[PDB]
C-alpha cells in the first residue's frame with residue numbers, strides 16, 4: 001500500500017471494488033505456475049527477452065573514466081520497456097476474465113505497447129490520449145490503429161496526459177466487470193505502483209545476472225530516466241538491497257529548472273495527493289497540477305511514482321536533472337559513437353551517465369537503462385537539429 | 386564461385402585484385418577463433434541475437450490449417466536481418482585493416498545497417514543511393530546521417546539501385562586499399578554471394594534448434610521473401626540437406642505479373658550478366674535492366690542471387706509471387722492478429738504462408754522468416770491504405 005508515507009489508495013468509493021478485485025487477483029496469480037509459464041513464454045518468444053547488456057567500449061574510451069554498459073530495452077518488441085508491463089497486465093486481465101483493456105498514454109509508447117499486447121491476447125483495446133498529445137504523435141497514433149486499437153482523444157481539461165488518466169479512471173469505474181485499466185507507469189492507487197514495478201523488475205534481474213557474467217561484480221552505479229518511474233524501478237529494484245550499488249534517476253530539466261519549463265517532480269514538485277496516491281507533483285500557486293515540458297515526449301507526467309519519492313526520502317537513490325540540450329547532445333553522441341539511436345527519454349539517462357563516468361575511475365561500472373529506441377523520435381529531432 | 390552455371394566474377398581487370406584479397410581474407414578469418422569470438426560477441430550483446438521463433442497461434446487458428454511460426458528477425462538491432470551481414474563484413478573489413486566502408490542501398494535498410502556497424506567499429510561510412518530512392522526514403526537517409534554516415538545521391542542512369550551499385554563499384558576500384566565494399570545481398574561477383582549467405586546463415590541455424598525444441602521435428606515448409614535473396618538464403622541454407630523440408634521463396638508480384646510492374650526475376654526474368662554475376666535479371670529486349678515495382682521498397686533489386694537461380698534449377702526450392710494487394714492485407718492482418726507490425730518485404734512471405742497454411746493439415750508446420758519490422762514502412766502504409 002505505502003512506501004514510507006508515500007503511495008496509498010486515496011480514491012472515491014466507486015474505485016474500491018475494482019482495486020480490491022485487482023489486488024486479490026494479483027495476489028492469486030503473481031506466483032501461479034500456469035500464469036508464469038505463459039508470461040515467460042510471451043516475454044521470451046514474442047517480446048524477445050532477455051535483452052542484452054552492451055559494453056559501450058568506444059563511448060567509455062572517449063570519455064576515459066568508468067565503463068559504461070547499456071541495458072538494451074530498446075531491443076524489446078515494440079521498441080521500449082513498456083511492453084514488459086503491457087504483457088504482464090494484459091495476461092493478468094485475461095486470467096481475470098476481462099475482454100477489454102484501456103490505457104492512458106502521452107508519448108504514445110504505452111498506448112502502442114497496450115495495443116500490441118491486446119492484439120496478442122485478443123482483447124478489445126481503447127487508448128485514452130489527450131488531444132494535444134494525439135496531434136503531436138501522429139505515427140504512434142497510426143501504429144495503435146494498425147494494431148486494431150481505438151484511440152479516444154481526450155478534449156477535457158488541459159487535453160494532455162493527466163486528463164487522459166482522469167477519463168480512463170471514469171471509464172474503468174463503469175466497465176471493470178469486463179475491462180482492465182492498464183496503467184503504464186508505477187503511479188496511481190495501490191496496487192498499481194507495485195504491479196508495474198513487479199512487471200518491470202525483469203530488467204534488473206537480467207542486468208544483475210549479465211553484469212556478474214561480464215565483469216564478475218555488481219555495478220557501482222545504475223542510471224535511468226524518470227517519467228512516472230517504471231523503467232527506473234524496473235532496473236533499480238533488484239539492486240535495492242545491494243549496499244555497494246548507487247541508484248540515480250534522471251528527470252527532465254527541460255529549458256532549465258529556473259525557466260519553469262521542465263518535468264522534474266522530485267527535484268522541484270510538492271508532495272500532494274493526486275490520481276489516488278500521495279507523492280511528488282508539479283503544481284502551481286493555486287495548487288492545481290501544472291503543465292510539464294521536455295523535448296522527450298515520454299517525460300510528460302506531472303508527478304512521479306511513490307516508490308521513488310520513498311527511495312529519495314531515505315536517500316537510497318539520488319535524483320538529478322538533465323536539460324533538453326544535454327539530452328539532444330547525448331542522442332547524437334550515442335548514435336555516432338556506438339551506432340545505437342536512443343529514445344529521447346533514454347538520452348537523458350545517457351547524458352547524465354556521460355557526465356558521471358568522466359568523474360569516475362576506469363575500474364568502476366555504470367549501467368544505463370536504455371528504455372527505448374529513437375525511431376519514434378526522428379521527426380522531433382529533424383525539426384530541432 | 387559457381388552455383389551450377391550461375392555466379393562467377395564478371396568484372397573489369399581492375400577489380401580482380403580487390404576480389405582476390407577479399408577471398409584470401411575471408412578464407413583466413415571464416416574459421417579464425419578470434420574473428421568468430423568477436424563476431425558472436427557483437428551479434429549477441431549489440432544486435433540482440435538469438436532472435437526468437439514465435440508461434441502465431443491466433444493467426445494459425447483463424448486460418449484453421451497448418452501451424453505458422455515466425456522467425457523474428459524484426460527484433461534484431463536496426464529492425465532487419467541486414468544487420469547480421471553488416472556486422473560480419475564490417476568486422477571482416479576491420480580485420481583486413483580497412484578504415485572505410487561503402488555500400489549501396491535501395492530501401493535504405495542496408496544503408497542504415499551499414500552505418501550502424503561502421504559507427505560501432507569506428508569506421509568511416511559512405512552509402513550510395515539512387516536519387517529517386519533518396520526521395521522516397523527521407524527517414525532512412527536521416528538515420529544514416531545520425532549514425533555519422535555520408536549519403537551520396539546517385540544522379541546517373543535511372544537514379545535507382547542498379548545505378549548506385551555501379552557507382553559503388555567505381556569507387557571501390559579507386560579505393561580498395563583502405564575501403565571495403567559491403568554488399569548487402571547474396572549478389573555481386575564471387576565471393577560476395579557466399580559470404581553474405583554465410584553471414585545470414587545464423588538465422589536458419591537458430592530457427593532449426595528453436596523448432597526442434599518447440600515441436601520435436603523439422604518444419605514441413607519454410608517461406609521467405611526474396612529481393613536479392615539474403616534473408617531467404619540465411620534461413621534456407623542450414624535446411625538444404627534436409628530432404629523433408631520444402632523451401633519457398635516469395636517474389637514481389639507488384640501490380641501483377643501480366644502488368645509487367647513487379648520485381649519477380651526468377652518468375653519472369655531472363656538469364657543475364659550484371660553486377661559481376663551470371664543470374665536471372667529483369668531485362669528488356671535490348672539487354673537493358675528494367676525498372677522494378679513493388680509496394681515493398683526492399684524488393685527493388687532487378688535481379689536475384691545466383692544461389693537462388695541454382696536452387697530453382699535443381700528444384701530444391703520453389704519460387705512464387707505475391708501481389709502488392711496481398712502483401713498489404715497480410716501486413717494489416719499480422720498487426721491485428723498477433724500485435725507484430727511486419728516490414729512490407731516480409732509481409733510478402735506472410736501472405737504466401739497464410740495461403741499455404743489453408744491448404745495444409747493442423748499437424749503440419751510452416752516457418753516464415755520475418756525479415757524486418759514495419760516501422761520504416763508506416764508512411765507508405767498511411768499513404769496507400771489511408772488513415773483510419
Ligand SMILES: Cc1ncc(COP(=O)(O)O)c(CN[C@@H](CO)C(=O)O)c1O
Nearest residue numbers: 106107109110227228229230231298372
Ligand atoms: C521510451 C520511454 N522511456 C521512458 C518513459 C518514461 O516513463 P517511465 O518513467 O514509466 O519509465 C516513457 C514514457 N512514455 C509514456 C508517457 O508519455 C507513454 O504514455 O508512452 C517512454 O515511452
Ligand SMILES: Cc1ncc(COP(=O)(O)O)c(CN[C@@H](CO)C(=O)O)c1O
Nearest residue numbers: 490491492494495612614615616683757
Ligand atoms: C527489411 C527487408 N527485408 C527484405 C529485403 C530483401 O533483401 P534480401 O532478399 O537480400 O533479404 C530488404 C532489402 N532492402 C535492401 C534493398 O533495397 C536495402 O538496400 O535496404 C529489406 O530491407
Ligand code: NA
Nearest residue numbers: 263265301303
Ligand atoms: Na514528472
Ligand code: NA
Nearest residue numbers: 648650686688
Ligand atoms: Na528481383
